[PDB]
Design a protein around this ligand. Structure first.
Ligand SMILES: CC(C)(COP(=O)(O)OP(=O)(O)OC[C@H]1O[C@@H](n2cnc3c(N)ncnc32)[C@H](O)[C@@H]1OP(=O)(O)O)[C@@H](O)C(=O)NCCC(=O)NCCS
Ligand SMILES: NC[C@H]1O[C@H](O[C@H]2[C@H](O[C@@H]3O[C@H](CO)[C@@H](O)[C@H]3O)[C@@H](O)[C@H](N)C[C@@H]2N)[C@H](N)[C@@H](O)[C@@H]1O
Ligand SMILES: [Ca+2]
Ligand SMILES: [Ca+2]
Length: 179
């Protein structure tokens, strides 16, 4: 059915910790910080701490069950080394994961990304959404393409080379109807 988003709260942190230590997630999420301890997740993902980095955390919901984690961020407002060429404060980036190995490759990630893109463009200040999957992460790249993102090129980030992908507000508008 329909994938929706709610703000993550401090009450979700234990659950997020469990998720971040599942093998299908560890593979693509964490980097240096792969397999975080409970304290790590509590210290790093508390919504008020993420707020200091211009990051907003969400829980993805399907049929009343939490099925994944997502975040949006102000690109111009990111940590040292991140998006240092950005000039547009309207640019938002996203990252996300599906909690359950059993639910991968069945279109749910595309639904989640579409829901996040729609949410973000419902802020009229937002001009463009970006994402930055690893070049190794072909599944994530395809999901993003299915959700309306276009590959731009390779960029150097603090987490290594990434495939920079974008979806502009104009593109989103044009694709809302076949009219
Ligand atoms: C990335 C993620 C959100 C994508 O969600 P998903 O529901 O698995 O993706 P979807 O099923 O919606 O779409 C994936 C597409 O990639 C293709 N694909 C699937 N596995 C693939 C693989 N191993 N290599 C290349 N392409 C693959 C699928 O065929 C599908 O395309 P198609 O519909 O044209 O056939 C999810 O797989 C996930 O959370 N993975 C672990 C964490 C992660 O990688 N997060 C993203 C970091 S940038
Ligand atoms: N797309 C999946 C990736 O998402 C996260 O990395 C994002 C990164 O997120 C930081 O990491 C913590 C929450 O994940 C916060 O500190 C944010 O600053 C963000 O600051 C960058 N602007 C974009 C990065 N892509 C993960 N950190 C990373 O491990 C994972 O591979
Ligand atoms: Ca406003
Ligand atoms: Ca149209």
């Amino acid at each position: 059915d329909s994938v929706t988003l709610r703000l993550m709260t401090e009450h979700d942190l234990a659950m997020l910790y469990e998720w971040l230590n599942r093998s299908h997630i560890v593979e693509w999420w964490g980097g240096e910080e792969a397999r975080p301890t409970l304290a790590d997740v509590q210290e790093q993902y508390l919504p008020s701490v993420l707020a200091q980095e211009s990051v907003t955390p969400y829980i993805a919901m399907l049929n009343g069950e939490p099925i994944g984690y997502a975040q949006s961020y102000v690109a111009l407002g990111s940590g040292d080394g991140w998006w240092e060429e950005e000039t547009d404060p309207g640019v938002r980036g996203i990252d996300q994961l599906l909690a359950n190995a059993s639910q991968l490759g069945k279109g749910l990630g595309t639904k989640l990304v579409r829901a996040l893109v729609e949410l973000l463009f419902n802020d009229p200040e937002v001009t463009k959404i970006q994402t930055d999957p690893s070049p190794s992460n072909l599944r994530a790249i395809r999901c993003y393409e299915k959700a309306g993102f276009e590959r731009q090129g390779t960029v150097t980030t603090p987490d290594g080379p990434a495939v920079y992908m974008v979806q502009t507000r104009q593109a989103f508008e044009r694709t809302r109807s076949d009219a």
